[PDB]
Paper text:
PSMD2 serves as a docking site for a number of substrate remodeling factors on the 19S regulatory particle and interacts with the ring of ATPases that unfold substrates for entry into the proteolytic chamber of the 20S core particle. Here, we use mRNA display to rapidly identify peptidic macrocycles that bind PSMD2, an essential component of the 26S proteasome. Determining the structure of PSMD2 at high resolution either alone or within the 26S proteasome has proven challenging due to the relatively small size of this subunit, the preferential orientation of the PSMD2 particles in ice and its intrinsic flexibility within the 26S proteasome. Here, we describe a new strategy of targeted protein degradation through direct substrate recruitment to the 26S proteasome.
To overcome these limitations, we reconstituted PSMD2 in the presence of MC1 and two fragment antigen-binding (Fab) ‘chaperones’ to determine a structure of the PSMD2–MC1–Fab complex with a resolution of ≈2.5 Å. Analysis of the binding pocket showed that MC1 uses the HRYxGW motif to associate with PSMD2, consistent with our mutagenesis results. Specifically, MC1H7 establishes polar contacts with the PSMD2E336 side chain and the backbone carbonyls of PSMD2P871 and PSMD2L873. The neighboring MC1R8 residue establishes a charge interaction with PSMD2E878 and hydrogen bonds with PSMD2H868. Residues Y9 and W10 hydrogen bond with the backbone carbonyl of PSMD2K773 and PSMD2N737, respectively. Finally, W12 establishes π-stacking interactions with PSMD2H770. Together these contacts span the wide and fairly shallow binding pocket with a buried surface area of 720.3 Å2, with the majority of interactions mediated by residues at opposite ends of the macrocycle’s long axis (~20 Å apart). A 2.5-Å-resolution cryo-electron microscopy (cryo-EM) structure of a PSMD2–macrocycle complex revealed that the ligand bound to a site of PSMD2 that is accessible in the assembled 26S proteasome and distinct from interfaces used by other PSMD2 binding partners, such as USP14.
Numbering used by the authors:
A (entry chain A): 260 to 349, 367 to 613, 649 to 849, 865 to 903
B (entry chain E): 29 to 34, 50 to 54, 92 to 98
C (entry chain F): 33 to 38, 53 to 62, 102 to 108
D (entry chain Z): 2 to 16
E (entry chain C): 1 to 3, 27 to 34, 90 to 99
F (entry chain D): 34 to 38, 52 to 62, 101 to 110
The structure:
């Protein structure tokens, strides 16, 4: 009798019929509470009949309602509640940089010195889209605080300035990510603007709804959104954003209506319009819809046969490598060894097992040194994907070397990749490198912008957050984290026009992957119960709550308590002798 | 309206506030 | 300057509350 | 922030 | 970059094609 | 398909003889 083991295996299989059949027929309540914590961490919400023994509490756990309070409690143990302004870490371009830095560092602590009681003083120092992303950063600071988040955002939903209102809509979506609040306040607030006359409003509302509902393929939210790709007033940017939102909401579900609607939107577009790089967001949403489903993808590869030849290579490659993202398939990697999405797909497939990942690391170094001049632009982003929140020294040395490339896009992507690799770690080596590289790229606005983003990303959450997609002994992959990471890195395969252009708000897709990296233990009543742990790697002695790093294993120091789950990661319930 | 409140049915026009 | 009266939002000066809820 | 130790939190400087 | 630093057994150094020889 | 040493790499249309094209072994 070890239902948390069976449940972990079922989650590995992604076979929700068996997950639901194992969660039921467990008679022990506290075991179900532990399994509910596991499901909440994995982003699976299962509907229960109100006549199950403890429906109220199992539902309350599964929806991460208490996540914010435990996170702030650990923030009180560390004495880190004080806000940091961006200059502590150290034109429109630099105010935009400061806004993103401020949001990244103060993420999940609802405090700030820029977005004060009155945020207009900061918002109106920005212009156009930078003001949209500034307004969106407020919702990133208030992450997982739905009630307080909306209470703070609400004043800006009535702004006369459309960019500020669009950013407030996106923020309102962001604060609802991961917290599955049983009120659907985001759907009520955002759903009137998905067909608004202003396209900027449509972008804010649709990206917000996509982030708020990324976990589950809600039929109502999908029925609301799917019409917007066919609207004659929708820009290609709006069609792309709609495909991203629908694929995030429907991630891994094989939803047929998303598939058919996207294929129709491809088949309608001119061979002249499919050159627009927002069109790359159309098949990304398609791949997200079939992420990890493997050999089933052939049925759709045949339907793409009619599409124009230049676009066809990209769509086919991206959708195919999405279908195999977790496989760690030796033969697809041989096939991949258009080119950018190929190398990104190599990383996306290889990250599932370590030997393939080391061979990928060798390949990526070879490509950065001697590869095709066009092909190497994507090579550092693949290094990000395979090693997010994992500050290896060899990877950082390689990226630091190529952060001076005379090709501007190799430089941009290497700096962003350093920020991704070091994200959520206060790594002093990386911080010093970034400071020196900031002194080198002074008088270079785009490289300096990438430097500020990487600096902010290193201090994400003041060191308390991670972006790694894996959890629970590095054996379960969060699909919503993968969807957010892929959204960002595929948008970085055209950094000069998407990220350095108008659409840098897509950086907020990283919020889908943000998770806490703290171990916390409870008694059987969910009351903070301090115990002592021996955190090694597989060592010092620590008292829970303890922050774990990327590859560390905690084991209870004494035999007084016994854990209900064999893995001491995240939230663990502890029984008595 | 799929975007309204009646509080919140178990505990108004959000956009217009009418 | 943290609430709206019944419509006026004196912060945004929007014209046409239980914080952000409709009630 | 400083750099706590008991709880395995690594800070940075300002600190 | 300029090159000092490190070359992975690429020894003249020929670390990459995009660096000065 | 080779390269000749400023340097020119025709097979890569890049402008900035190596024994090996893949790794440039001297």
């Amino acid at each position: 009798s070890r239902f948390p083991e069976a449940l972990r295996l079922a989650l590995m299989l992604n076979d929700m019929e068996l997950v639901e059949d194992i969660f039921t027929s467990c008679k022990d309540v506290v075991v179900q509470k532990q399994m509910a914590f596991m499901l909440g961490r994995h982003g699976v919400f299962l509907e229960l009949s109100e006549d199950v023994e403890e429906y109220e509490d199992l539902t309350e756990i599964m929806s991460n309602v208490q996540l914010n309070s435990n996170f702030l409690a650990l923030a009180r143990e560390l004495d880190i509640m004080e806000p940091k302004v961006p200059d502590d870490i150290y034109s429109a371009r630099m105010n935009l940089a400061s806004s993103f830095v401020n949001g990244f560092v103060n993420a999940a602590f609802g405090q700030d010195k820029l977005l004060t009681d009155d945020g207009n003083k900061w918002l109106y120092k920005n212009k156009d889209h930078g003001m949209l992303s500034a307004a969106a950063s407020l919702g990133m600071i208030l992450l997982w605080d739905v009630d307080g988040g909306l209470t703070q955002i609400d004043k800006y939903l009535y702004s006369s300035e459309d960019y500020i209102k669009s950013g407030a809509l996106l923020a309102c979506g962001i604060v609802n990510s991961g917290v599955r609040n049983e009120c659907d306040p985001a759907l009520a607030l955002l759903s009137d603007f998905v067909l608004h006359n202003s396209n900027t409003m449509r972008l804010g509302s649709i990206f917000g709804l996509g982030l708020a509902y990324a976990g589950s393929n809600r039929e109502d939210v999908l029925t609301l959104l799917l019409p917007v790709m066919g609207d004659s007033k929708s820009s290609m940017e709006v069609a792309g954003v709609t495909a991203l939102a629908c694929g995030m909401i429907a991630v891994g579900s094989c939803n047929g209506d998303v598939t058919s609607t996207i294929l129709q939107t491809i088949m309608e577009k001119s061979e002249t319009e499919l050159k627009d790089t927002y069109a790359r967001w159309l098949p990304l949403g398609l791949g997200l819809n079939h992420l990890g489903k493997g050999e089933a993808i052939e049925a759709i590869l045949a339907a793409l046969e009619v599409v124009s030849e230049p676009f066809r290579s990209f769509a086919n490659t991206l959708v195919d490598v999405c279908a195999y993202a977790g496989s760690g398939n030796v033969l697809k990697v041989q096939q991949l060894l258009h080119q950018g999405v190929a190398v990104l797909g190599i990383a996306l497939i290889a990250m599932g097992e370590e030997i393939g990942a080391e061979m990928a690391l060798r390949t990526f170094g070879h490509l950065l040194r001697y590869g095709e001049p066009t092909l190497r632009r994507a090579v550092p982003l693949a290094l990000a994907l395979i090693s997010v929140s994992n500050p290896r020294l060899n990877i950082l040395d390689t990226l630091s070397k190529f952060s001076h490339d005379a090709d501007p896009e190799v430089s941009y992507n290497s700096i962003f990749a350093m920020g991704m690799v070091g994200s959520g770690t206060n790594n002093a080596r990386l911080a010093a490198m970034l400071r020196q590289l900031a002194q080198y790229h002074a008088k270079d606005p785009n490289n300096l912008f990438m430097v500020r983003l990487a600096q902010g990303l290193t201090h994400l959450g003041k060191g308390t957050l991670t972006l790694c997609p894996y959890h629970s002994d590095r054996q379960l992959m969060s699909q919503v984290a993968v969807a957010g990471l892929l959204t960002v890195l595929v948008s970085f395969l055209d950094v000069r026009n998407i990220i350095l252009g108008k659409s840098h708000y897509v950086l907020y897709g990283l919020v889908a992957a943000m998770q806490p990296r703290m171990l916390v233990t409870f008694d059987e009543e969910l009351r903070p119960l301090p115990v002592s742990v021996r955190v090694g790697q597989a060592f010092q002695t620590h008292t829970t709550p303890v922050l774990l790093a990327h590859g560390e294993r905690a084991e209870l120091a004494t035999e007084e308590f016994l854990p209900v789950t064999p893995i001491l990661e995240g939230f663990v319930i502890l029984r008595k002798n | 309206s799929v975007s309204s409140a009646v509080y919140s049915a178990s505990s108004y026009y959000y956009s217009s506030s009418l | 300057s943290s609430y709206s009266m019944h419509y006026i939002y004196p912060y945004s000066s929007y014209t046409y509350k239980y914080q952000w809820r409709g009630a | 922030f400083p750099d706590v130790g008991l709880h395995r939190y690594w800070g940075w400087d300002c600190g």
